[PDB]
Amino acid sequence: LFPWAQIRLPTAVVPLRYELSLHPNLTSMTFRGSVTISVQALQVTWNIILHSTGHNISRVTFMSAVSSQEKQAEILEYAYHGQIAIVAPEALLAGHNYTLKIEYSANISSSYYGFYGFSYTDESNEKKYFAATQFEPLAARSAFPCFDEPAFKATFIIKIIRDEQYTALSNMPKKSSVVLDDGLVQDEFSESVKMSTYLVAFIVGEMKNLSQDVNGTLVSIYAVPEKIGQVHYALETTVKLLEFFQNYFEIQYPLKKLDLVAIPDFEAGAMENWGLLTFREETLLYDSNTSSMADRKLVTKIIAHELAHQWFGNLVTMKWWNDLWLNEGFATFMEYFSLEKIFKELSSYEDFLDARFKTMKKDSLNSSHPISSSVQSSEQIEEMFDSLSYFKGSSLLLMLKTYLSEDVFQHAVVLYLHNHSYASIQSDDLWDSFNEVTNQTLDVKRMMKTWTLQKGFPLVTVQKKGKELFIQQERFFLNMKTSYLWHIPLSYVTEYSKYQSVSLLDKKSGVINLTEEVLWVKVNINMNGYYIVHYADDDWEALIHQLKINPYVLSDKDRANLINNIFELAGLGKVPLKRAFDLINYLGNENHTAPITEALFQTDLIYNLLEKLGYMDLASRLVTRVFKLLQNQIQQQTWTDEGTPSMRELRSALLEFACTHNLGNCSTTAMKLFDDWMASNGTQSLPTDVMTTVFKVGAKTDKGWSFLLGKYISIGSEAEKNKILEALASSEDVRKLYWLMKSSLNGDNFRTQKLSFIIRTVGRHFPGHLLAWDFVKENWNKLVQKFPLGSYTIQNIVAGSTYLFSTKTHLSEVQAFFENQSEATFRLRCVQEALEVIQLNIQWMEKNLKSLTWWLRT
């Protein structure tokens, strides 16, 4: 009988110091290692419980400090929790330090999880090799036996045997690299600071570097030698942010080195490893002449995310996986917060607003879950890794920073990162630190627990009867045919004099007292609060009018929030749909990107749901109306890569609109630009902001489609290829659309990683709509082999082939598919939320279809 029968490690023995010596071969994908773990007991036990998986233990030696001699001990295993147990020869007593040394043999991983390894092809067709480490959930126990929980912090000394050609890196700077008589170099790195096991990292690969010292901190970027020229934007950005976060958090970067590694595999780990920040190669390559604005924003945000964890998440770690939404939600917040003070040109607020629009649509579903849950299973650990929970957490932290001051927010974080530095905590302690810096006036820990321990988000109903604005609270329930209260930080803007105040609604009913009689009111300023506002019939119609007469009294964030709200409220039936189109009838006087892109989002969802239902004529009258609303804005656009970054995205949105629907000249301007490019054999430049639009119009011909296929299988840019791939799947030849999906699943010409992108693109248009869902049904077993159930890929594939069905016939068809597979498969959240969105599409027609046949075509 194993001495421990729980998923969490015992709170008895605690690690203090790790010595890890490893000999990785990479050619064999087998490594040998020894670990020396200096532990202390705070309680008395005869058995030491710790983690290890897939290790051939050769010897385990126990030792006390009262001897210089090693003692034998027996070792047991319980692989269901990955736990190993060392029975003790001496009853470990309280306070007393002991030392365990384990020798083992193991394989290098091929699953890109744990100590992984792979092969790649260089500038010549040379098989160069590479190894790296991804442990973020529970894979540190696969490389070496340890206490694999984030609370059990310790210091680490990493020692690895390499071959002279291969550079070896880890978390800490390197101390002793000595040559051995075998012909092999052994590197030893400095002893770590107190860090968690999931953040340890070590990498053995043939790389070069583009380093730069600042303030004793040597920021360095490592990549495969053929790609060092394209890492210059990353280093210039990694330095402006390491300055910013240091002076924001008011703590210095703890370590001496900051290494950023671009791993040369597409299935690589991108974790916030302390010192050794791992990324994918395409995530860090940028060129100021060939890459896009959206290619610039992605690199500028992925560095900021992983840099923010070097304070929040590695210096001060969370104790368990129940609070991973807080660590990753803070960094997702720090992405958009750092890139608005020092990278304000990129207009990153337009990205956070769209990400918060989409987070609210999938949190509104009844299949959503409270972010704070109980994690007592390993599947529950590996289901805390949801991008929705990370973006809802950033949405709550935005609401906290706006309700409090920006400065009150920082003072809490600086004090929290000082009090709990080099240790582990829980989510309530951050809320406690807010309550200290607010001088115990308001309770943030109660205010947040209404959002963390609860599902969904509120619907705040508003009715201004004079100078009294009546506010009411409800859950955004979508079934439109228990929950509790939220401490909702309210905000409003009224008006020729402008007002701006902040309140707090802690009841189901409330009234805010206005200082004047006003003509229009807008609640949730810039949608900084995680709620939807339903105004009354008169109150909505005031805002619809003030958008006709000077819409720019509100911000672009606020005008986008109204378009999003009135269209989502109309789908539930709370608003007639003719009121949402009255609201967007102001768009002839709109010049900002964020209200136009969201209005084009809502109309495209209506177009595509109506197109799959067969009401093609009504769908064209919808897009020929938004075109007439946006006709001057579209015709004023230039087919270039010039302007502000926000204006460089309105061009890509409006030209993709006019070309997909063949409205105006767009298609003949793109086809001329395509034909010149096709006839330059791909050597002519296309402006990046019109590149995908040009590729799609040309891919509608057998000639131009076959040219693009040869450019994908040859050319080097895995960003220009993914605009080619989208265009190839925008064909209307069903035979081509089936051949693309068949090829990716079998790994011919395209990679199996890109299959989620192909099925999503084939199924969103009419010629491949039924073809995509049929491919998912008839290749399901092979899909669940190549992507396990509950993966993000299997969720994206199911949603991307199903979210446009709007008939009860289709709802029964999709239900009867998954029921006649497994009860397990029928209870996955991918298939329950999918059958839920078909019902909301079924009812969207029941509440808005026959009315649309009236005002359109009249």
Ligand SMILES: *[C@@H]1O[C@H](CO)[C@@H](O[C@@H]2O[C@H](CO)[C@@H](O[C@@H]3O[C@H](CO[C@H]4O[C@H](CO)[C@@H](O)[C@H](O[C@H]5O[C@H](CO)[C@@H](O)[C@H](O)[C@@H]5O)[C@@H]4O)[C@@H](O)[C@H](O[C@H]4O[C@H](CO)[C@@H](O)[C@H](O)[C@@H]4O)[C@@H]3O)[C@H](O)[C@H]2NC(C)=O)[C@H](O)[C@H]1NC(C)=O
């Ligand atoms: C704006 O201006 C308005 C009007 O002045 C303010 O609204 C009033 O706030 C006060 C302070 O909280 C409220 O007094 C409390 O009333 C409750 C219950 O009393 C009942 O009284 C009425 C019947 O006689 C009825 O109209 C009330 O209805 C309100 O509440 C219900 C349910 O909560 C809700 O459904 C309604 O929509 C109304 O909102 C209510 O049923 C009483 O329990 C309170 O006593 C507790 O709290 C006080 C401190 O708050 C404490 O001293 C006590 O010891 C006890 O713990 C308190 O008497 C009043 O009811 C509100 N009136 C209305 C019409 O809303 C508003 O606060 C102003 N806002 C701002 C930002 O200034």
Ligand SMILES: *[C@@H]1O[C@H](CO)[C@@H](O[C@@H]2O[C@H](CO)[C@@H](O[C@@H]3O[C@H](CO)[C@@H](O)[C@H](O[C@H]4O[C@H](CO)[C@@H](O)[C@H](O)[C@@H]4O)[C@@H]3O)[C@H](O)[C@H]2NC(C)=O)[C@H](O)[C@H]1NC(C)=O
């Ligand atoms: C999208 O369109 C809107 C609507 O046109 C537009 O808002 C306008 O911006 C301009 C530029 O800031 C505003 O003009 C200024 O208003 C301020 C008052 O806030 C004045 O101080 C300014 O006066 C100076 O400049 C004048 C000439 O430009 C001089 O005559 C004067 O003596 C001053 O030197 C200037 O009038 C304008 O008021 C707004 N209009 C509205 C309705 O908001 C917005 O900028 C556009 N956005 C983009 C990205 O194009």
Ligand SMILES: *[C@@H]1O[C@H](CO)[C@@H](O[C@@H]2O[C@H](CO)[C@@H](O[C@@H]3O[C@H](CO)[C@@H](O)[C@H](O)[C@@H]3O)[C@H](O)[C@H]2NC(C)=O)[C@H](O)[C@H]1NC(C)=O
């Ligand atoms: C892993 O184990 C393999 C053997 O299983 C070791 O392979 C060796 O790889 C090195 C790479 O530097 C080879 O050395 C080279 O030898 C050639 C002469 O053949 C010389 O021209 C080069 O300059 C270089 O010195 C070596 O031949 C090869 N040994 C074999 C194939 O038996 C490898 O060293 C091990 N790696 C580690 C980290 O232990």
Ligand SMILES: *[C@@H]1O[C@H](CO)[C@@H](O[C@@H]2O[C@H](CO)[C@@H](O[C@@H]3O[C@H](CO)[C@@H](O)[C@H](O)[C@@H]3O)[C@H](O)[C@H]2NC(C)=O)[C@H](O)[C@H]1NC(C)=O
């Ligand atoms: C430094 O961090 C410690 C945590 O290690 C902070 O201690 C915490 O302080 C808050 C503030 O009062 C305590 O919250 C209260 O707890 C009681 C029960 O303990 C509860 O009844 C109240 O409703 C409230 O939630 C919290 O318990 C406490 N935790 C511990 C473990 O002591 C401390 O405040 C921080 N100090 C500084 C200067 O940063």
Ligand SMILES: *[C@@H]1O[C@H](CO)[C@@H](O[C@@H]2O[C@H](CO)[C@@H](O[C@@H]3O[C@H](CO)[C@@H](O)[C@H](O)[C@@H]3O)[C@H](O)[C@H]2NC(C)=O)[C@H](O)[C@H]1NC(C)=O
């Ligand atoms: C038009 O584009 C096509 C690509 O679809 C070109 O064919 C390819 O051109 C590349 C170079 O641009 C060839 O690579 C070369 O290979 C030779 C060995 O054959 C090597 O010595 C060179 O250093 C270079 O690496 C590639 O072989 C070739 N063929 C294919 C099937 O991809 C074509 O050349 C372009 N036409 C013109 C007129 O440039």
Ligand SMILES: *[C@@H]1O[C@H](CO)[C@@H](O[C@@H]2O[C@H](CO)[C@@H](O)[C@H](O)[C@H]2NC(C)=O)[C@H](O)[C@H]1NC(C)=O
């Ligand atoms: C490294 O990979 C080898 C691949 O053969 C593993 O060997 C197999 O392991 C399983 C499970 O332990 C056995 O049931 C098979 O009988 C083994 N097959 C062969 C051909 O040896 C090996 O287990 C892996 N390394 C470790 C440490 O588990």
Ligand SMILES: *[C@@H]1O[C@H](CO)[C@@H](O[C@@H]2O[C@H](CO)[C@@H](O)[C@H](O)[C@H]2NC(C)=O)[C@H](O)[C@H]1NC(C)=O
């Ligand atoms: C790559 O790394 C090397 C090693 O640190 C860098 O070379 C050092 O550069 C510093 C300045 O950053 C000099 O003070 C040292 O004299 C150099 N030492 C050695 C051993 O080379 C190098 O600059 C980095 N960057 C590039 C582009 O090669």
Ligand SMILES: CCOC(=O)C1=C(NC(C)=O)Oc2cc(O)ccc2[C@@H]1c1cccnc1
């Ligand atoms: C960035 C990609 O890194 C990885 O490969 C893994 C990571 N990494 C991070 C940051 O999440 O963890 C999870 C967590 C999950 O819930 C599900 C899958 C994974 C995979 C995994 C697991 C088993 C085999 N192959 C891959």
Ligand SMILES: *[C@@H]1O[C@H](CO)[C@@H](O)[C@H](O)[C@H]1NC(C)=O
């Ligand atoms: C580990 O590998 C060695 C190598 O041959 C083998 O002799 C041994 O039986 C394995 N297991 C143990 C427990 O040492």
Ligand SMILES: *[C@@H]1O[C@H](CO)[C@@H](O)[C@H](O)[C@H]1NC(C)=O
């Ligand atoms: C265990 O090691 C720590 C680190 O030096 C030390 O402070 C502590 O006193 C040691 N325990 C005993 C019983 O000496």
Ligand SMILES: *[C@@H]1O[C@H](CO)[C@@H](O)[C@H](O)[C@H]1NC(C)=O
């Ligand atoms: C340089 O680093 C040291 C490290 O302690 C720090 O004290 C000093 O303030 C830094 N200088 C800066 C950030 O300009």
Ligand SMILES: *[C@@H]1O[C@H](CO)[C@@H](O)[C@H](O)[C@H]1NC(C)=O
């Ligand atoms: C919401 O989901 C739960 C989970 O099974 C279910 O029990 C409940 O009936 C659902 N609510 C509605 C209104 O369908």
Ligand SMILES: *[C@@H]1O[C@H](CO)[C@@H](O)[C@H](O)[C@H]1NC(C)=O
């Ligand atoms: C909290 O109290 C301290 C007392 O010195 C004061 O300096 C600070 O301004 C107060 N904070 C707030 C938000 O009132």
Ligand SMILES: *[C@@H]1O[C@H](CO)[C@@H](O)[C@H](O)[C@H]1NC(C)=O
């Ligand atoms: C389209 O091209 C023709 C070519 O003469 C031109 O007359 C017309 O104005 C163009 N329309 C737009 C919207 O660019």
Ligand SMILES: [Zn+2]
């Ligand atoms: Zn992260």
